């Protein structure tokens, strides 16, 4: 067994540590069949693993990461670790933004691919719910792939309401304001907010709303968008959430061109539509693709949608992971 314990059999060799994923270790390895280096995640936090495997195996899209192979023991009794193989990417948007200034051409291309991938995700009635720069992979030619479906769910807008200050799992800085107020994040509008945050981050190389805690996140958002309007407050029926907003001092809107003085005016018009406080008035993925900022790339005949809507104890969980990974077994 290969050590870094990463027994990926004889096919994958010359292992190098990349970092640490949620359920385990990520390494690069040399694929001896395809004669290229690949990424491998070792999975040794259980439910998220099965959900993501199911989604990634079902989806087939240029801007969504795919699973090349899955390594595991031939029997349920012997199965301990599960290894997921993917193409080795050059970097991610998080690492790129830490050291590289993006040209308007790069921002435009990255945004287009994010939305193209998101169109397909949403067409499958799925919400990613954790879009952020570290979940956007890039190769040496800037082709972008969305990864990490660990928090993804089937859209359920009829069961989206909840009380004020409901605990949320997704990365704080990319959370839409309704999550802190009255939303479970069961609607498509939640992903568009995260894309809007990513666009603002590509424009200045810094997160636009770096909240330090749950409620600080909301005050960061309102410090730029300004106090919500009466109309936008009327949409919030939950009295505790609406009264919290009414208790705050008036905050002025910070004009986008003041925050981003070197940004393209069309990029700011699209940003404004994505970072709309009211989720019902927030732009949808297909309108965002049709926005004049992305006119060079927009081609709905080359922006595929999914063929069908996607639909979903410890012993049963292990058995389901065994069953979902059976297609990669060498006995076929
Ligand atoms: O190729 C990867 C890469 C890392 C990951 C990764 N990070 N966290 C988890 C995983 C991951 C890897 C694989 Cl191979 C499968 C799954 Cl499900 C998840 C995926 N691809 N990278 C990381 C960013 O810069 C260098 C290139």
CB 57 near ligand 1, within 6 Å: no
Q: Domain 1-88+313-332 adopts which CATH fold?
A: Phosphorylase Kinase; domain 1 (3.30.200)
Tell me if 23 is assigned to a ligand binding site: yes
Experimental technique, in short, is X-ray
Q: Helical H runs in the chain?
A: 47-58, 93-99, 104-123, 189-204, 216-225, 230-234, 239-247, 256-259, 265-274, 285-289, 314-324
Q: How far apart are CA 111 and CA 291, in angstroms?
A: 11
Q: How far apart are CA 263 and CA 200, in angstroms?
A: 10
Provide the residue count of the chain.
332
Nearest to 309 by CA among 63, 150, 145, 120: 120
Q: How far apart are CA 135 and CA 146, in angstroms?
A: 6
Domains 1-88+313-332 and 89-312 equal at CATH topology level: no
Q: How far apart are CA 270 and CA 233, in angstroms?
A: 23
Quick check: 111 and 199 in contact, CB under 8 A? yes
- Coil, helix or strand at residue 204: helix
CB 54 near ligand 1, within 6 Å: no
β-sheet with 82-87: strand ranges across: 12-20, 25-31, 36-43, 82-87, 69-71
Q: How far apart are CA 184 and CA 179, in angstroms?
A: 6
Atom of ligand 1 nearest to the CA of 52: 17
Given the structure tokens 């002025």, which residue do they identify? 252
Give rounded-to-5 percent helix, strand, coil for the chain: 40, 15, 45
- Coil, helix or strand at residue 64: strand
- DSSP string spanning 256-323? HHHH-TTS-HHHHHHHHHHS-SSTTTSPPHHHHHTSGGGTTT--GGGS---SS-----HHHHHHHHHH
Quick check: 145 and 137 in contact, CB under 8 A? yes
Nearest CA to ligand 1 atom 22: 91
Q: Which residues pair with 28 in a beta bridge?
A: 16, 39
Q: Helical H runs in 124-215?
A: 189-204
Atom of ligand 1 nearest to the CA of 40: 14
Distances (CA, A) of 83 to 2, 12, 107, 215, 232: 13, 11, 33, 38, 47
Kind of pairing, strands 136-138 and 91-92?
antiparallel
Quick check: 136 and 92 in contact, CB under 8 A? yes
Q: What is the CATH number of domain 89-312?
A: 1.10.510.10
269 is catalytic: no
Residue 98: Cβ-neighbour burial (10 angstroms; 0-12, 13-18, 19+): exposed
Quick check: 7 and 26 in contact, CB under 8 A? no
Quick check: 153 and 128 in contact, CB under 8 A? no
Q: Using only C-alpha atoms, what is the Rg of the chain?
A: 21
User: Given in angstroms, what resolution was this structure solved at?
Assistant: 2.0
CB 26 near ligand 1, within 6 Å: yes
Angle in degrees, CA 67, 117, 157, rounded to 5: 105
Q: How far apart are CA 273 and CA 80, in angstroms?
A: 47
- Token pair listed for 258: 């003041």
Distances (CA, A) of 320 to 48, 68, 284, 314: 12, 20, 34, 10
Q: How far apart are CA 319 and CA 77, in angstroms?
A: 10
- Angle, helix 314-324 to helix 47-58, in steps of 10 degrees: 20
Tell me if 18 is assigned to a ligand binding site: yes
Domain ranges of the chain: 1-88+313-332, 89-312
Q: How far apart are CA 207 and CA 196, in angstroms?
A: 11
Round to the nearest angstrom and report the end-to-end CA distance of the chain: 23
Distances (CA, A) of 180 to 7, 70, 172, 212, 268: 43, 38, 10, 14, 25
Q: How many Cβ atoms sit within 10 Å of the Cβ of residue 227?
A: 17
Atom of ligand 1 nearest to the CA of 39: 14
CB 84 near ligand 1, within 6 Å: yes
Q: How far apart are CA 100 and CA 93, in angstroms?
A: 10
Quick check: 206 and 249 in contact, CB under 8 A? no
Count Cα atoms within 13 angstroms, Cβ side, for 294: 25
Nearest to 104 by CA among 201, 194, 203, 206: 203
Quick check: 224 and 254 in contact, CB under 8 A? yes
Quick check: 228 and 245 in contact, CB under 8 A? yes
CB 21 near ligand 1, within 6 Å: yes
Active-site hit among 130, 148, 191, 232: 130
Q: How far apart are CA 296 and CA 179, in angstroms?
A: 34
């Amino acid at each position: 067994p290969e050590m870094v314990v990463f027994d990926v059999g004889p096919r994958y060799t010359n292992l190098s540590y990349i970092g640490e994923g949620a359920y385990g270790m990520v390494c690069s390895a040399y694929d001896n069949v395809n004669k290229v280096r690949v990424a491998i995640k070792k999975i040794s936090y259980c439910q998220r693993t099965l959900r993501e495997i199911k989604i990634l195996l079902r989806f087939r899209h240029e801007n969504i990461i795919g699973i090349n192979d899955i390594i595991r023991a031939p029997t349920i009794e012997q199965m301990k670790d599960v290894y997921i193989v993917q193409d080795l990417m050059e970097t991610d948007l998080y690492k790129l933004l830490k050291t590289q200034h993006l040209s308007n051409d790069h921002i435009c291309y990255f945004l287009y691919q994010i939305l193209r991938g998101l169109k397909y995700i949403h067409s499958a009635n799925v919400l990613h719910r954790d879009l952020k720069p570290s979940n956007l992979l890039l190769n040496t030619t800037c082709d972008l792939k969305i990864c990490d479906f660990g928090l993804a769910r089937v859209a359920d807008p009829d069961h989206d309401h909840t009380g004020f200050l409901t605990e949320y799992v997704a990365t704080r800085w990319y959370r839409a304001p309704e999550i802190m107020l009255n939303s479970k994040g069961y609607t498509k509008s939640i992903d568009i907010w995260s894309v809007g945050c990513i666009l603002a981050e590509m424009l200045s190389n810094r997160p636009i709303f770096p909240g330090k805690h749950y409620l600080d996140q909301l005050n960061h958002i309102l410090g730029i968008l300004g106090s919500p309007s009466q109309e936008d407050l009327n949409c919030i029926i939950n009295l505790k959430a609406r009264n919290y907003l009414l208790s705050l001092p008036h905050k002025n809107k910070v004009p986008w061109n003041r925050l981003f003085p070197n940004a393209d005016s069309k990029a700011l018009d699209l940003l404004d539509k994505m970072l709309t406080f009211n989720p019902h008035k927030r732009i949808e993925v297909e309108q965002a693709l049709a926005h004049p900022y992305l006119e060079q790339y927009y081609d709905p005949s080359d922006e595929p949608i999914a063929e069908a809507p996607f639909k979903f104890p410890k012993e049963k969980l292990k058995e389901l992971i065994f069953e979902e990974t059976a297609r990669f077994q060498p006995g076929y």
